[PDB]
Coordinates of C-alpha atoms and ligand atoms in Angstrom, one line a residue:
Chain T
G1 CA 0.0 0.0 0.0
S2 CA 1.0 3.6 -0.4
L3 CA -0.2 7.2 -0.1
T4 CA -1.2 8.7 -3.5
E5 CA 0.8 11.5 -5.3
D6 CA -0.8 14.4 -3.4
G7 CA -0.4 12.5 0.0
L8 CA -4.2 13.1 0.8
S9 CA -5.4 9.5 0.3
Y10 CA -4.1 5.9 0.5
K11 CA -4.4 2.9 -1.8
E12 CA -3.8 -0.8 -1.1
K13 CA -4.4 -4.0 -3.1
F14 CA -5.6 -7.3 -1.5
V15 CA -5.8 -10.8 -3.0
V16 CA -9.2 -12.4 -1.7
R17 CA -8.4 -15.5 0.5
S18 CA -10.0 -19.0 0.5
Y19 CA -11.4 -18.5 4.1
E20 CA -12.6 -15.0 3.3
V21 CA -15.4 -16.2 0.9
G22 CA -19.0 -17.4 1.3
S23 CA -21.1 -19.9 -0.6
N24 CA -20.9 -17.9 -3.8
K25 CA -17.0 -18.1 -3.7
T26 CA -16.9 -14.2 -3.4
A27 CA -15.9 -12.2 -0.3
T28 CA -18.3 -11.8 2.5
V29 CA -19.4 -8.3 3.7
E30 CA -17.4 -9.0 6.9
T31 CA -14.3 -9.7 4.8
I32 CA -14.9 -6.3 3.0
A33 CA -15.4 -4.5 6.4
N34 CA -12.0 -6.1 7.7
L35 CA -10.2 -4.9 4.6
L36 CA -11.7 -1.3 5.0
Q37 CA -10.4 -1.3 8.7
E38 CA -6.9 -2.6 7.5
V39 CA -6.5 0.1 4.7
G40 CA -7.6 2.7 7.2
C41 CA -5.0 1.6 9.8
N42 CA -2.3 1.5 7.1
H43 CA -3.3 5.1 6.0
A44 CA -3.0 6.3 9.7
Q45 CA 0.4 4.7 10.1
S46 CA 1.7 6.2 6.8
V47 CA 0.8 9.8 7.9
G48 CA 2.6 9.6 11.3
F49 CA 0.1 8.1 13.7
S50 CA 1.4 5.7 16.4
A51 CA -5.3 7.3 14.8
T52 CA -4.8 9.5 17.9
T53 CA -2.8 12.6 17.3
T54 CA -0.4 14.2 20.0
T55 CA -3.2 16.4 21.5
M56 CA -5.6 13.5 21.8
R57 CA -3.0 11.4 23.6
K58 CA -2.5 14.2 26.2
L59 CA -6.3 14.6 26.8
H60 CA -6.9 10.8 26.8
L61 CA -9.2 11.2 23.8
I62 CA -9.9 8.4 21.2
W63 CA -12.0 8.2 18.0
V64 CA -15.0 5.8 18.1
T65 CA -17.3 4.7 15.2
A66 CA -20.8 6.2 15.3
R67 CA -22.0 4.8 11.9
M68 CA -20.8 2.5 9.1
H69 CA -22.4 2.5 5.6
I70 CA -21.2 0.1 2.9
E71 CA -22.7 -0.4 -0.7
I72 CA -21.3 -3.2 -2.8
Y73 CA -22.1 -3.6 -6.6
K74 CA -19.9 -6.8 -7.1
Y75 CA -18.2 -8.9 -4.4
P76 CA -14.6 -9.9 -5.4
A77 CA -14.1 -13.6 -6.1
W78 CA -11.6 -15.8 -4.4
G79 CA -8.1 -15.1 -5.9
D80 CA -9.2 -11.8 -7.3
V81 CA -7.3 -8.6 -6.5
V82 CA -9.4 -5.6 -5.1
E83 CA -7.9 -2.1 -4.8
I84 CA -9.2 0.0 -2.0
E85 CA -8.6 3.8 -1.8
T86 CA -9.4 5.6 1.6
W87 CA -9.3 9.2 2.8
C88 CA -10.5 11.2 5.8
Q89 CA -12.3 14.6 6.3
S90 CA -13.0 16.8 9.2
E91 CA -16.8 17.5 9.7
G92 CA -16.2 20.6 11.9
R93 CA -16.8 20.0 15.6
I94 CA -19.1 17.0 15.0
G95 CA -16.4 14.6 14.4
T96 CA -14.6 13.0 11.3
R97 CA -15.5 10.9 8.4
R98 CA -13.5 8.1 6.6
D99 CA -14.5 7.2 3.1
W100 CA -13.5 4.3 0.9
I101 CA -13.8 3.2 -2.8
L102 CA -13.3 -0.3 -3.9
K103 CA -12.2 -1.3 -7.5
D104 CA -11.6 -4.4 -9.5
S105 CA -7.8 -4.2 -10.0
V106 CA -7.9 -5.6 -13.6
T107 CA -10.8 -3.6 -15.0
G108 CA -10.5 -0.4 -12.9
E109 CA -14.3 -0.5 -12.4
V110 CA -15.8 0.7 -9.0
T111 CA -17.2 -2.4 -7.3
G112 CA -18.2 -0.8 -4.0
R113 CA -18.0 2.3 -1.8
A114 CA -18.3 3.0 2.0
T115 CA -18.4 5.8 4.6
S116 CA -18.0 6.0 8.3
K117 CA -18.7 8.7 10.9
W118 CA -16.4 8.9 13.9
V119 CA -16.9 10.9 17.2
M120 CA -14.5 11.8 20.0
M121 CA -14.7 10.1 23.3
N122 CA -12.7 10.4 26.6
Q123 CA -11.3 6.8 26.8
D124 CA -11.7 6.6 30.6
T125 CA -15.1 8.2 31.3
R126 CA -16.6 7.1 27.9
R127 CA -18.0 10.7 27.6
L128 CA -18.5 11.9 24.0
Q129 CA -17.3 15.3 23.1
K130 CA -17.0 17.9 20.2
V131 CA -13.7 18.2 18.3
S132 CA -11.5 21.0 19.5
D133 CA -9.7 23.5 17.3
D134 CA -6.2 22.1 18.1
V135 CA -7.3 18.6 17.0
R136 CA -9.0 19.9 13.9
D137 CA -5.9 21.9 12.9
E138 CA -3.4 18.9 13.4
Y139 CA -5.8 16.6 11.4
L140 CA -6.5 18.9 8.5
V141 CA -3.0 18.7 7.0
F142 CA -3.7 15.0 6.1
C143 CA -7.3 15.5 4.6
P144 CA -8.4 17.1 1.2
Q145 CA -9.4 20.7 1.8
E146 CA -12.3 20.6 -0.7
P147 CA -15.2 18.1 0.0
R148 CA -14.5 14.6 -1.5
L149 CA -17.4 12.3 -0.8
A150 CA -17.8 8.5 -1.6
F151 CA -21.6 9.3 -1.3
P152 CA -22.1 12.8 -2.8
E153 CA -25.9 12.7 -3.6
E154 CA -28.1 15.0 -1.4
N155 CA -30.3 13.1 1.0
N156 CA -28.5 9.7 0.2
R157 CA -28.9 6.4 2.1
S158 CA -25.7 6.9 4.1
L159 CA -27.3 9.8 6.1
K160 CA -30.8 8.4 6.7
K161 CA -32.2 8.3 10.2
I162 CA -32.8 4.6 11.5
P163 CA -35.9 3.8 13.5
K164 CA -36.0 1.5 16.6
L165 CA -37.4 -2.0 15.8
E166 CA -40.5 -2.7 18.0
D167 CA -41.2 -6.0 19.7
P168 CA -42.1 -8.7 18.5
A169 CA -39.3 -9.1 15.9
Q170 CA -40.1 -11.1 12.8
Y171 CA -36.7 -13.1 13.2
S172 CA -34.1 -13.4 16.0
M173 CA -30.8 -15.1 16.9
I174 CA -30.3 -15.0 20.7
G175 CA -27.3 -15.7 22.9
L176 CA -24.6 -14.4 20.7
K177 CA -21.2 -13.8 22.5
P178 CA -17.8 -12.8 21.5
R179 CA -14.8 -15.1 21.5
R180 CA -11.1 -14.1 21.6
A181 CA -11.0 -13.9 17.8
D182 CA -13.7 -11.3 17.9
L183 CA -11.5 -8.9 20.1
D184 CA -8.9 -6.4 18.9
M185 CA -5.4 -5.7 20.2
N186 CA -6.9 -3.6 23.0
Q187 CA -9.4 -6.5 24.0
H188 CA -12.4 -4.6 22.7
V189 CA -15.0 -6.2 20.4
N190 CA -14.0 -5.5 16.7
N191 CA -16.5 -3.3 14.8
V192 CA -16.9 -6.0 12.2
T193 CA -18.2 -8.6 14.7
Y194 CA -21.4 -6.4 15.2
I195 CA -22.0 -6.6 11.4
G196 CA -21.8 -10.4 11.7
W197 CA -24.2 -10.4 14.6
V198 CA -26.7 -8.2 12.8
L199 CA -26.6 -10.6 9.8
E200 CA -27.2 -13.7 12.0
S201 CA -31.0 -13.0 12.2
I202 CA -31.5 -12.7 8.4
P203 CA -33.1 -16.1 7.3
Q204 CA -30.8 -18.4 5.4
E205 CA -33.4 -18.5 2.5
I206 CA -32.6 -14.7 1.9
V207 CA -28.9 -15.2 2.0
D208 CA -29.2 -18.2 -0.5
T209 CA -31.3 -16.2 -3.0
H210 CA -30.2 -12.6 -2.6
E211 CA -27.0 -10.6 -2.5
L212 CA -26.5 -7.9 0.2
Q213 CA -26.4 -4.6 -1.7
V214 CA -26.4 -2.0 1.2
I215 CA -25.9 -2.1 5.0
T216 CA -26.1 0.9 7.4
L217 CA -25.2 0.4 11.0
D218 CA -25.4 2.8 14.0
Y219 CA -23.1 1.9 17.0
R220 CA -24.8 3.2 20.2
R221 CA -22.9 1.3 23.0
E222 CA -20.2 -1.2 23.2
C223 CA -20.6 -4.9 23.8
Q224 CA -18.1 -5.9 26.5
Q225 CA -16.1 -9.1 26.3
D226 CA -18.4 -10.7 29.0
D227 CA -21.7 -9.5 27.5
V228 CA -24.3 -11.6 25.5
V229 CA -26.3 -10.1 22.7
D230 CA -29.7 -10.9 20.8
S231 CA -29.9 -10.0 17.1
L232 CA -33.4 -9.0 16.0
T233 CA -34.7 -8.4 12.4
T234 CA -38.0 -7.4 10.7
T235 CA -38.7 -7.3 7.0
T236 CA -39.8 -3.6 6.0
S237 CA -40.2 -4.2 2.3
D238 CA -35.6 -6.1 -3.5
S239 CA -35.9 -7.1 0.1
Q240 CA -35.2 -4.5 2.9
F241 CA -34.8 -5.3 6.7
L242 CA -34.7 -3.3 10.0
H243 CA -32.2 -4.6 12.6
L244 CA -31.6 -4.2 16.3
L245 CA -28.8 -5.7 18.5
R246 CA -29.4 -5.5 22.3
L247 CA -28.1 -7.0 25.5
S248 CA -29.7 -10.4 26.2
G249 CA -30.6 -9.6 29.8
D250 CA -31.9 -6.1 30.2
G251 CA -32.4 -5.3 26.5
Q252 CA -30.1 -2.3 26.3
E253 CA -29.6 -1.2 22.7
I254 CA -26.1 -1.6 21.3
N255 CA -26.7 -1.2 17.5
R256 CA -29.5 -0.5 15.1
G257 CA -29.3 -0.8 11.2
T258 CA -30.9 -1.6 7.9
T259 CA -30.0 -3.8 5.0
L260 CA -31.1 -3.9 1.3
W261 CA -30.8 -7.1 -0.6
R262 CA -31.2 -7.7 -4.4
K263 CA -32.6 -11.1 -5.8
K264 CA -29.8 -13.1 -7.6
Chain U
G1 CA 3.0 -17.2 -3.9
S2 CA 4.8 -19.7 -6.1
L3 CA 5.9 -23.4 -6.4
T4 CA 9.6 -23.7 -5.7
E5 CA 12.3 -24.7 -8.3
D6 CA 11.6 -28.5 -8.1
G7 CA 7.8 -28.0 -8.1
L8 CA 7.5 -30.2 -5.0
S9 CA 6.7 -27.4 -2.4
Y10 CA 5.0 -23.9 -2.4
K11 CA 6.0 -20.6 -0.7
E12 CA 3.9 -17.6 0.0
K13 CA 4.5 -14.3 2.0
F14 CA 1.9 -12.6 4.1
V15 CA 1.9 -9.1 5.8
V16 CA 0.3 -9.5 9.3
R17 CA -2.9 -7.4 9.5
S18 CA -4.2 -5.0 12.2
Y19 CA -7.3 -7.3 13.0
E20 CA -5.1 -10.5 13.0
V21 CA -3.1 -9.6 16.1
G22 CA -3.9 -10.1 19.9
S23 CA -2.9 -8.1 23.0
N24 CA 0.8 -8.5 22.4
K25 CA 0.4 -6.9 18.9
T26 CA 1.5 -10.2 17.4
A27 CA -0.5 -12.8 15.2
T28 CA -3.0 -15.1 17.1
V29 CA -2.6 -18.9 16.7
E30 CA -5.9 -18.7 14.8
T31 CA -4.4 -16.2 12.3
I32 CA -1.4 -18.6 11.9
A33 CA -3.8 -21.5 11.3
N34 CA -5.8 -19.5 8.6
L35 CA -2.5 -18.6 6.8
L36 CA -1.5 -22.4 6.9
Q37 CA -5.0 -23.3 5.3
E38 CA -4.5 -20.4 2.7
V39 CA -1.0 -21.4 1.6
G40 CA -2.3 -25.0 1.4
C41 CA -5.1 -24.0 -0.9
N42 CA -2.7 -22.0 -3.1
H43 CA -0.4 -25.0 -3.4
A44 CA -3.3 -27.3 -4.4
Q45 CA -4.5 -24.8 -7.1
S46 CA -0.9 -24.3 -8.4
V47 CA -0.6 -28.0 -9.1
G48 CA -3.9 -28.4 -11.0
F49 CA -6.5 -29.4 -8.2
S50 CA -10.1 -28.0 -7.4
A51 CA -7.6 -30.8 -3.3
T52 CA -9.7 -33.6 -4.8
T53 CA -8.0 -35.6 -7.6
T54 CA -9.9 -36.7 -10.7
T55 CA -10.4 -40.3 -9.4
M56 CA -11.6 -38.8 -6.0
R57 CA -14.3 -36.7 -7.8
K58 CA -15.4 -39.8 -9.7
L59 CA -15.9 -41.8 -6.4
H60 CA -17.3 -38.8 -4.4
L61 CA -14.3 -38.9 -2.0
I62 CA -12.9 -35.9 0.0
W63 CA -9.8 -35.3 2.3
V64 CA -10.8 -34.5 5.9
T65 CA -8.4 -33.3 8.7
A66 CA -7.8 -36.0 11.4
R67 CA -5.1 -34.0 13.4
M68 CA -3.5 -30.5 13.3
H69 CA -0.2 -29.9 15.3
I70 CA 1.4 -26.4 15.4
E71 CA 4.6 -25.2 17.3
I72 CA 5.4 -21.5 17.3
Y73 CA 8.7 -20.0 18.5
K74 CA 7.9 -16.4 17.7
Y75 CA 4.5 -15.0 16.6
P76 CA 5.0 -12.4 13.8
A77 CA 4.2 -8.7 14.8
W78 CA 1.6 -6.5 13.1
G79 CA 3.1 -5.3 9.8
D80 CA 5.7 -8.0 9.7
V81 CA 6.2 -10.3 6.7
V82 CA 6.1 -14.1 7.4
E83 CA 7.0 -16.6 4.7
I84 CA 5.3 -20.0 4.7
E85 CA 6.6 -23.1 2.9
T86 CA 4.3 -26.1 2.5
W87 CA 4.4 -29.6 1.0
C88 CA 2.4 -32.8 1.0
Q89 CA 3.4 -36.5 1.4
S90 CA 1.6 -39.8 1.0
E91 CA 1.4 -42.0 4.1
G92 CA 0.7 -45.1 2.2
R93 CA -3.0 -46.3 2.6
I94 CA -3.5 -44.5 6.0
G95 CA -3.9 -41.0 4.3
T96 CA -1.8 -38.0 3.5
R97 CA 0.2 -35.4 5.5
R98 CA 0.7 -31.6 4.8
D99 CA 3.6 -29.9 6.5
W100 CA 4.6 -26.3 6.9
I101 CA 7.6 -24.1 7.9
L102 CA 7.2 -20.5 8.9
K103 CA 10.0 -18.0 8.6
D104 CA 10.7 -14.4 9.4
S105 CA 11.1 -12.9 5.9
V106 CA 13.8 -10.4 7.0
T107 CA 16.1 -12.7 9.0
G108 CA 15.3 -16.1 7.3
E109 CA 15.0 -17.6 10.8
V110 CA 12.4 -20.5 11.4
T111 CA 9.6 -19.0 13.7
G112 CA 7.2 -21.9 13.6
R113 CA 6.4 -25.2 12.1
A114 CA 3.2 -27.4 11.6
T115 CA 1.9 -30.8 10.4
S116 CA -1.5 -32.1 9.7
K117 CA -2.9 -35.7 9.0
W118 CA -5.7 -36.1 6.4
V119 CA -7.9 -39.2 5.9
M120 CA -10.2 -40.0 2.9
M121 CA -13.9 -39.9 3.5
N122 CA -17.0 -40.6 1.1
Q123 CA -18.6 -37.1 1.1
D124 CA -22.2 -38.5 1.2
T125 CA -22.0 -41.4 3.6
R126 CA -19.3 -39.8 5.8
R127 CA -17.6 -43.3 5.9
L128 CA -13.7 -43.2 6.3
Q129 CA -11.6 -45.3 4.0
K130 CA -8.0 -46.3 3.0
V131 CA -6.3 -44.6 0.1
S132 CA -6.5 -46.6 -3.1
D133 CA -3.5 -47.2 -5.5
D134 CA -5.0 -45.0 -8.2
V135 CA -5.3 -42.0 -5.8
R136 CA -1.9 -42.7 -4.3
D137 CA -0.3 -42.7 -7.8
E138 CA -2.2 -39.5 -9.0
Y139 CA -0.9 -37.4 -6.0
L140 CA 2.6 -38.9 -5.8
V141 CA 3.9 -36.8 -8.7
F142 CA 3.3 -33.6 -6.6
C143 CA 5.1 -34.9 -3.5
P144 CA 8.8 -35.4 -2.5
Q145 CA 9.7 -39.0 -2.9
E146 CA 12.2 -39.1 0.0
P147 CA 10.6 -38.3 3.4
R148 CA 10.6 -34.6 4.3
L149 CA 9.3 -33.9 7.7
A150 CA 8.6 -30.6 9.5
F151 CA 8.8 -32.7 12.8
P152 CA 11.6 -35.2 12.3
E153 CA 12.4 -36.0 16.1
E154 CA 12.3 -39.7 17.2
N155 CA 9.1 -39.6 19.4
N156 CA 8.0 -36.0 18.9
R157 CA 4.8 -34.3 20.3
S158 CA 3.0 -34.4 16.9
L159 CA 2.4 -38.1 17.1
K160 CA 1.5 -38.5 20.8
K161 CA -1.8 -40.2 21.8
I162 CA -4.3 -37.7 23.5
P163 CA -6.4 -39.1 26.4
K164 CA -10.1 -38.2 27.0
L165 CA -10.6 -35.5 29.7
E166 CA -12.7 -36.9 32.7
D167 CA -15.6 -35.0 34.3
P168 CA -15.5 -32.6 36.2
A169 CA -13.3 -30.4 34.0
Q170 CA -11.2 -27.7 35.9
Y171 CA -12.4 -24.9 33.5
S172 CA -15.3 -24.7 30.9
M173 CA -16.9 -22.3 28.4
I174 CA -20.4 -23.4 27.5
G175 CA -22.9 -22.7 24.7
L176 CA -20.4 -21.9 21.9
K177 CA -22.1 -21.8 18.4
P178 CA -20.8 -20.9 15.0
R179 CA -21.9 -17.8 13.1
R180 CA -21.8 -17.4 9.2
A181 CA -18.2 -16.0 9.4
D182 CA -17.1 -19.4 11.1
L183 CA -18.3 -21.3 7.8
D184 CA -16.4 -22.0 4.7
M185 CA -17.5 -21.8 1.1
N186 CA -19.3 -25.2 1.4
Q187 CA -21.2 -24.1 4.6
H188 CA -19.1 -26.4 6.8
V189 CA -17.4 -25.1 10.1
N190 CA -13.9 -23.9 9.3
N191 CA -11.2 -26.2 11.0
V192 CA -9.7 -23.0 12.6
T193 CA -13.0 -22.3 14.5
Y194 CA -12.4 -25.5 16.6
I195 CA -8.9 -24.1 17.7
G196 CA -10.6 -20.9 18.8
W197 CA -13.3 -22.9 20.7
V198 CA -10.7 -25.1 22.4
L199 CA -8.8 -21.9 23.6
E200 CA -12.0 -20.3 25.0
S201 CA -11.7 -22.4 28.2
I202 CA -8.1 -21.4 28.9
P203 CA -8.3 -18.8 31.8
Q204 CA -7.4 -15.2 30.7
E205 CA -4.7 -15.1 33.5
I206 CA -2.8 -17.8 31.5
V207 CA -3.2 -15.9 28.2
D208 CA -2.1 -12.6 29.8
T209 CA 1.1 -14.2 31.3
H210 CA 2.1 -17.0 28.9
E211 CA 2.6 -17.5 25.2
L212 CA 1.1 -20.6 23.5
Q213 CA 4.0 -22.7 22.3
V214 CA 2.4 -26.0 21.1
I215 CA -1.2 -27.0 20.2
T216 CA -2.2 -30.6 19.1
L217 CA -5.8 -31.1 18.1
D218 CA -7.7 -34.4 17.0
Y219 CA -10.8 -33.9 15.0
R220 CA -13.3 -36.8 15.7
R221 CA -16.6 -35.4 14.4
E222 CA -17.9 -32.3 12.7
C223 CA -19.8 -29.6 14.5
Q224 CA -22.9 -28.8 12.2
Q225 CA -24.0 -25.2 11.5
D226 CA -27.0 -25.7 13.9
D227 CA -25.0 -27.5 16.8
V228 CA -23.8 -26.0 20.1
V229 CA -20.5 -26.9 21.7
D230 CA -19.0 -26.9 25.2
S231 CA -15.2 -26.3 25.6
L232 CA -13.6 -28.2 28.5
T233 CA -10.0 -27.7 29.9
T234 CA -8.0 -29.3 32.8
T235 CA -4.3 -28.4 33.8
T236 CA -2.1 -31.4 33.5
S237 CA 1.3 -29.8 34.6
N238 CA 7.8 -22.4 34.1
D239 CA 5.6 -24.2 31.6
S240 CA 1.8 -24.9 31.8
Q241 CA 0.2 -27.8 30.0
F242 CA -3.5 -28.4 29.6
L243 CA -5.8 -31.2 28.3
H244 CA -8.9 -30.1 26.2
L245 CA -12.2 -31.6 25.1
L246 CA -14.9 -30.1 22.8
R247 CA -18.3 -31.9 22.9
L248 CA -21.9 -31.2 21.9
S249 CA -23.8 -29.2 24.6
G250 CA -26.7 -31.5 24.8
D251 CA -25.8 -35.2 24.6
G252 CA -22.0 -34.8 25.2
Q253 CA -20.8 -36.4 21.9
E254 CA -17.1 -35.8 21.5
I255 CA -16.1 -33.5 18.5
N256 CA -12.4 -32.7 19.4
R257 CA -9.7 -33.5 21.9
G258 CA -6.3 -31.8 22.3
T259 CA -3.4 -30.5 24.4
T260 CA -1.7 -27.1 24.6
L261 CA 1.8 -26.2 26.1
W262 CA 2.4 -22.6 27.3
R263 CA 5.6 -20.9 28.2
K264 CA 5.7 -18.0 30.9
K265 CA 6.4 -14.7 29.2
Ligands
RXS301 C1 -12.4 -16.4 27.2 C2 -13.2 -15.3 26.7 N1 -13.9 -15.3 25.6 C3 -14.5 -14.0 25.5 C4 -14.1 -13.2 26.6 N2 -13.2 -14.0 27.3 C5 -12.5 -13.7 28.6 C6 -11.7 -12.4 28.5 C7 -11.7 -11.6 29.6 C8 -10.9 -10.4 29.6 C9 -10.1 -10.1 28.4 C10 -10.2 -11.0 27.3 C11 -9.4 -10.7 26.2 N3 -8.9 -10.5 25.2 C12 -11.0 -12.1 27.4
RXS302 C1 -27.8 -18.0 10.7 C2 -26.8 -19.0 11.0 N1 -25.8 -18.9 11.8 C3 -25.1 -20.1 11.9 C4 -25.8 -21.0 11.1 N2 -26.9 -20.3 10.6 C5 -27.9 -20.8 9.7 C6 -27.4 -21.6 8.5 C7 -28.1 -22.6 8.0 C8 -27.7 -23.3 6.9 C9 -26.6 -22.9 6.2 C10 -25.9 -21.8 6.6 C11 -24.7 -21.3 5.9 N3 -23.8 -20.9 5.4 C12 -26.3 -21.1 7.8

């Protein structure tokens, strides 16, 4: 991987692995989401991050994902090479955004795109906060100054408000719990695990006859390593679904989302 | 990746990813096991397979893992490049063996080694069988003729018999179940998922203070996509050793047994 000529974005190529594909012999959306996190980490390393900047480390502040939105036109097949370009942008005091474009390396055709919203949190109190001027200034030298959007369209799917699923859910998968492979280097549940848990309550008949085109996921609260989650899904329709992940015991919301599926 | 000069082994380099590492910022043993499966698949593809031979497909036969044995001296760090070499060998009519050697790409130093035993099974009946002469001849042109062992030692750990853990277990993790990410392209549970499930019943205090040096796992029966598993562990021992058992949560049918050896950091 490498930063592009202007140093304001980063590109990396990945060869899709045998264990990374589903029944169609193409990459799962969780494999895609892991590759998006990997190219994002490689971009942060390339621009000098140990993605906390020096001012954030002094104030014990970290970036946390508020929303992930991914749209796939074609999933890369096993053995195929996918090229992913990523970049960041400041969204004033709200937080930051990281965008991605996925391309077929042979044809140069765009096969997918993604966007994510990040908010600042104090790592100890877990209290959310606005982005300060010092953090905005030290971040802005690594971002394009003019807007560059993976989802430019006004009122597009990536910005839509997601409602809360009402009981009873049409489908459910209960008792989901993370294992050590679901944790990151800081012993926190990996953001991609929540995508897998949301998808657990989609009936296999949909998975067997449809391809996932769009997924939007809001992250409200973290699942701890010792927590247990229930995954709930209701059809709202192409097939569209509304999703909710909540703690198995008291029903505290951890995520809400929507998925759009196209018949194969 | 590529076959070596003589065409009897295959090498591939991997850059360790951010999500592939644990608390020490080095690759987990499950990341290592996935890389071993990946280089094995790339080797089979390079020599013309798709690893069922022509005679195997005619008779509806497949290879299934009977045992996996991995020894790691140093886990590669995040961003490091690891080179893995793999090869296969026929073990007469018993089955086949696939071996691997892991090296640090910069220093050329061996950082790990692994071996696995495979047996033939009829895909439909699930009945095990001996390897026929036609199958043995068809895959012998892709294997070294002289023995080449990742574990040459006289009575090495990779061949030891594993006993059955007796109840009560010292530690347990109950109600483990696969999700879609644990399945392969044929909707079967990936062999690496069972390694993760075995390790779930090792106490976190051991994981925090020790490094896993050796794991040997016997595969007795498959966990189906709708099954639920219990992971059981008992200490058998500066080094800590454990005995492991995975069984179905309901009736207690054995699916795997194994042992792990850990060295204090
Ligand atoms: C055995 C197990 N499966 C899920 C959680 N855990 C336990 C645990 C506790 C604290 C930190 C970690 C890490 N890393 C893990
Ligand atoms: C929702 C879920 N989590 C684990 C199993 N499953 C259901 C299932 C059934 C049959 C085939 C497959 C595949 N592939 C999956």
